[PDB]
């Protein structure tokens, strides 16, 4: 009842799932249940809506396929279905960010990104430019330009 009563007044809510806390991909914001009044064409524009909707829909689609994988196996599913996982893993990993106030817990100074680079980077990750970079390279990075460096580091 307390969250149910609180949910009626917010204009934008971001939810945190302890599963994401245990996965080691911070912050723990779950994209599925996070919604806002700003996602309208007259406020964010058309360059925002299509990419956000595609990423949201892909992350919703992966949720049940990953559970099917837990029993049916890993190659019994078709290759086209496996591509959904192959790209959703990268999409979810790239959501992590190296913060500036977490320097005590991370030991790192962080990085900075503007919104233009965020929409731009998601467009590239859906474009297929980064299929061959390892997933673990996307953990706790900021601007997309850092990723190719971390792979260079590896």
């Amino acid at each position: 009842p307390a969250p149910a009563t609180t949910f009626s007044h917010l204009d934008a809510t971001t939810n945190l799932e302890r599963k994401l806390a245990e996965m080691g991909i911070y912050p723990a914001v779950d994209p599925l249940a996070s919604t806002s009044r700003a996602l309208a064409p007259e406020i964010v524009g058309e360059e925002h809506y299509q990419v956000a909707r595609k990423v949201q829909q892909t992350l919703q689609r992966y949720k049940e396929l990953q559970d099917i994988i837990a029993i049916l196996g890993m190659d019994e599913l078709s290759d086209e279905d496996k591509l959904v996982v192959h790209r959703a893993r990268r999409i979810q990993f790239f959501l992590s960010q190296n913060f500036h106030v977490a320097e005590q817990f991370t030991g790192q100074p962080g990085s900075y990104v503007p919104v233009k680079e965020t929409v731009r980077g998601f467009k590239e990750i859906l474009e297929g430019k980064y299929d061959h970079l390892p997933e673990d390279a996307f953990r706790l990075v900021g601007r997309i330009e850092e990723v190719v460096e971390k792979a260079k580091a590896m």
Partner: protein
């Protein structure tokens, strides 16, 4: 946790539906594969009238088709060429050509799962035209027995799901009833106190 059993209920339901789908596609493909093999039988019969090989299924959920042949071939050789990726994996473990991923119903000693349609699979042990005819007949028999074994695997797999759902659903109603009873008991105790 009631949410745990709820999520398990949905997951088991959807996995069982997927296994039922696997069952019906396997049944249809098995009928068509058996028809193909039967149509091929007369040509082997007429053409026949006029190192060890082991073959396995190409991916999982095949049941006991894979073990029963690899074990017997291995034993019969250490006592005194492989087709299939799990067959190559069985030699990646331990130590011992790798034609793989040929299309289903493929076109043109030996140890193989011999052909019968209903349930069972027999482990069996056995000039260019002669060799081609025997290897092709053997491979067709094995490919039919593979779909038969897959049919059986799905038919066994699709059953225990329903029992598991019914027992979790019963646990779900009992958890409900216990929760409501505890809640009302606390509420009425508070009301009586105040």
């Amino acid at each position: 946790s009631l949410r745990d059993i709820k999520t398990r209920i949905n997951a088991t339901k959807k996995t069982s539906q997927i296994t039922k789908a696997m069952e019906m596609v396997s049944t249809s493909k098995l009928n068509r594969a058996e028809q193909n093999a039967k149509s091929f039988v007369p040509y082997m019969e007429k053409i026949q009238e006029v190192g060890y090989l082991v073959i396995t299924s190409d991916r999982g959920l095949a049941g006991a088709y894979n073990s029963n042949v690899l074990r017997l071939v291995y034993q019969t050789i250490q006592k005194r060429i492989v087709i299939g990726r799990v067959g190559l994996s069985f030699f990646r473990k331990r130590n011992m050509l790798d034609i793989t991923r040929l299309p289903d119903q493929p076109s043109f000693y030996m140890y193989y799962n011999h052909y019968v349609s209903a349930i069972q699979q027999e482990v069996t042990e056995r000039l260019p035209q002669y060799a081609e005819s025997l290897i092709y007949g053997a491979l067709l028999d094995a490919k039919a027995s593979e779909h038969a074994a897959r049919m059986t695997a799905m038919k066994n797999a699709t059953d225990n799901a329903n029992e598991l759902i019914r027992t979790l659903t019963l646990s779900y109603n009992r958890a409900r009833q216990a929760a409501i009873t505890q809640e009302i008991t606390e509420i009425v105790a508070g009301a009586n106190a105040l």
